From a paper:
His domain protein tyrosine phosphatase (HD-PTP/PTPN23) is a tumor suppressor that regulates mitogenic receptor downregulation, endocytic recycling, and cell migration (Chen et al., 2012, Doyotte et al., 2008, Kharitidi et al., 2015, Lee et al., 2007, Ma et al., 2015, Manteghi et al., 2016). A central feature of HD-PTP function is the ability of its Bro1 domain to recruit CHMP4, the major subunit of the ESCRT-III membrane remodeling protein complex (Doyotte et al., 2008, Ichioka et al., 2007, Parkinson et al., 2015). Crystallographic structures of the HD-PTPBro1 domain in complex with the relevant binding regions of SARA, endofin, and all three human CHMP4 isoforms reveal that SARA and endofin binding is similar to that of CHMP4 at the conserved site, but critically extends into a neighboring specific pocket unique to HD-PTP. Altogether, this study identifies the Bro1 domain of HD-PTP as a highly selective interaction hub that coordinates recruitment of endosomal signaling adaptors versus MVB sorting and receptor degradation.
However, the two hydrophobic pockets, critical for binding of the CHMP4 peptides, are occluded in the apo-HD-PTPBro1 structure, requiring several side-chain conformational changes to accommodate the peptides. This may contribute to maintaining HD-PTP in an inactive status by minimizing interactions between cytosolic pools of CHMP4 and HD-PTP. In contrast, these pockets are fully open in the apo structures of Alix and Brox (McCullough et al., 2008, Mu et al., 2012). In the apo-HD-PTPBro1 structure these are blocked by the side chains of K141, K192, and R198. Thus, binding of CHMP4A/B/C to HD-PTPBro1 requires rearrangement of these side chains to accommodate the critical CHMP4 Leu and Trp residues. A major finding from the structural analysis is that the endofin and SARA binding site expands from the common site to a neighboring specific pocket (S site), not occupied by the CHMP4 peptides and fully accessible in the apo-HD-PTPBro1 structure. Significantly, the S site appears fully open and accessible in the structure of the apo-HD-PTPBro1, and no major conformational changes are observed upon binding of SARA/endofin peptides.
Numbering used by the authors: 1 to 361
Write the structure that this text describes.
Amino acid sequence: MEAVPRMPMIWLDLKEAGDFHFQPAVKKFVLKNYGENPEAYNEELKKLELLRQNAVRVPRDFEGCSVLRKYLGQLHYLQSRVPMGSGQEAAVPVTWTEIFSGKSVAHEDIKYEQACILYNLGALHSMLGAMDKRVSEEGMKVSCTHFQCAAGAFAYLREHFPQAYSVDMSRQILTLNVNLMLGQAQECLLEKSMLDNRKSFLVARISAQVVDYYKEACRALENPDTASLLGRIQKDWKKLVQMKIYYFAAVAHLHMGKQAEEQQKFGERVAYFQSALDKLNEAIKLAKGQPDTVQDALRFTMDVIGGKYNSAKKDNDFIYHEAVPALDTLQPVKGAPLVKPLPVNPTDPAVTGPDIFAKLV
């Protein structure tokens, strides 16, 4: 199974930015509150406006992440010296496009700008995670980290910002995004654990957790309100996710049968391989219409599980003569969560660079 073809991964589009005319409001504030020449900080203002145009049209590569993190950190450093939040003195309109409707949504709130950047940091991480072939140890590790970082950005957004600046960043949609991203992170780790040939029981538990994360996403996708908001995106996500629930349930029970093999529980081995085959047959049904990438992974896995089942049953029928337990007596596999949303510290100097606005007060 370490050589199974990789399943495709879902990634999220980045949001499109509108205007954020911060320069006039910063100049008035410096004049009326610091008493200094309003244009003594034009080079700091020039650095920020350049950084914004770079961020709102960011390159879709790993370097793009540092650009977004730079701009996000510098917005924090600006907010801590110039009050531009909701209701505050120097607040100006911030406009971005809500991604599911295409409608412009404006708020006079610098935290809306921060939120949309953080959203795009999560989305870019999801795209970089989904781009790798995931065939090397380092590519599997890096993809896993990108999906955890994506989860981290959407989780931070959900926890630290006035909920619902727009409906693409509502708490329930962000939670769907987190659970999908963690499910994809855990899938990357499952692939890595099979390459590393970890203990069969641990691999089963890792796979069971992939199922658990994808069940959380699937339940959220079945919410009619979310289906309505996402439109055909909900159909495309749900088809892949529901298929993967049965696929990784098959992979889990395959590895429970390998544990039984190792323990010389040869009737239990047959039962788990039979259950794995039943779960895989449902996944193949649910995969109708999916791309060849999905079919190639399922075809490969059917060869593995079908061959293991036929030989386990032959061995048991002609050698071991052990009783085969009913499938509904098998101990369920408890997922092993080995991923988490990974930090967004917006003001870590190692990532923000020098504070553009250090020479303010």
